[PDB]
Amino acid sequence: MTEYKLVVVGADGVGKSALTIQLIQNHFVDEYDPTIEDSYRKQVVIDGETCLLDILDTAGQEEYSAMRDQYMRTGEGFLCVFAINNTKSFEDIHHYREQIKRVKDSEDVPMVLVGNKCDLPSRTVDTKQAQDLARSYGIPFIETSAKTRQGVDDAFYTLVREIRKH
């Protein structure tokens, strides 16, 4: 039995809350309720190990950006979420990744690049663009949908596997 402190980060509206609520409660939140800070818990078996996921759902709003330092210091692994219909959110990954590396004084932080909202009929951020970014960071890239559950379990489980490896 091992606890893993996971942090879900990204721009305001990429679907951080919807991804976490889908993982835990098995349902899609269609509403847009801006987050200040919430934490969720999930006990799952990953590679025969009982994993106690302590998931922090953070604010995309810059209004609460001062809270970032303490949670980045405490967090073991990070899901860096952008939406596939939002180029700006994809560009923001660099700024989130830079802050995490600086605060933790480490370039080798367990991290997973998450391209959310892949259920959408149209896309602005190409799969190859995101694969190339993940390859440049040396981290895994997983396409997800908080609506259909596409890649949601793989995103969180892969992050746990990155923490264990580190």
Ligand X SMILES: Nc1nc2c(ncn2[C@@H]2O[C@H](COP(=O)(O)OP(=O)(O)CP(=O)(O)O)[C@@H](O)[C@H]2O)c(=O)[nH]1
Ligand Y SMILES: O=C1N[C@H](c2c(CNCc3ccc4ccn(Cc5ccccc5)c4c3)[nH]c3ccccc23)c2cc(O)ccc21
- Provide the binding-site residues for ligand Y, judged by CB under 6 A: 5, 7, 37-39, 54, 56, 67, 70-71, 74-75
Considering beta carbons, is residue 51 or 83 the nearer one to ligand X? 83
CA distance 123 to 120: 7
Our finding on whether 17 is near Mg ion (CB under 5 A) is: yes
Q: Considering beta carbons, is residue 116 or 158 the nearer one to ligand X? A: 116
CA distance 160 to 153: 11
Only segment of 28-36, 46-54, 79-87, 95-103 that touches Mg ion (CB under 5 A): 28-36
**DSSP string for 15-69:** SHHHHHHHHHHS----S----SEEEEEEEEEETTEEEEEEEEEE--SGGGGGGHH
**Residue 100 host element (H or E):** helix 87-103
Is residue 91 within 8 A of residue 102, CB to CB? The reply is no
* 35 lies in the binding site for ligand X (CB under 6 A): yes
Binding of ligand X by 61 (CB under 6 A):
yes
Window of 48-56, 93-101, 113-121, 133-141 that interacts with ligand X by CB under 6 A: 113-121
Long-range contact pairs involving 43-49 (C-beta distance under 8 Å, separation at least 24): 44/157, 46/157, 46/160, 46/161, 47/161, 49/2
Residue 58 as a binder of Mg ion (CB under 5 A): the answer is no
The residue from 59, 112, 125, 160 that contacts ligand X (CB under 6 A) is 59
Q: Does 34 bind ligand X (CB under 6 A)?
A: yes
The DSSP element (H or E) to which 2 belongs, if any, is: strand 2-10
Using the rule CB under 6 A, give the single segment among 33-41, 66-74, 94-102, 107-115 that binds ligand X: 33-41
The site for ligand X (CB under 6 A) is made up of 10, 12-18, 29-30, 32-35, 59-61, 116-117, 119-120, 145-147
The site for Mg ion (CB under 5 A) is made up of 16-17, 35
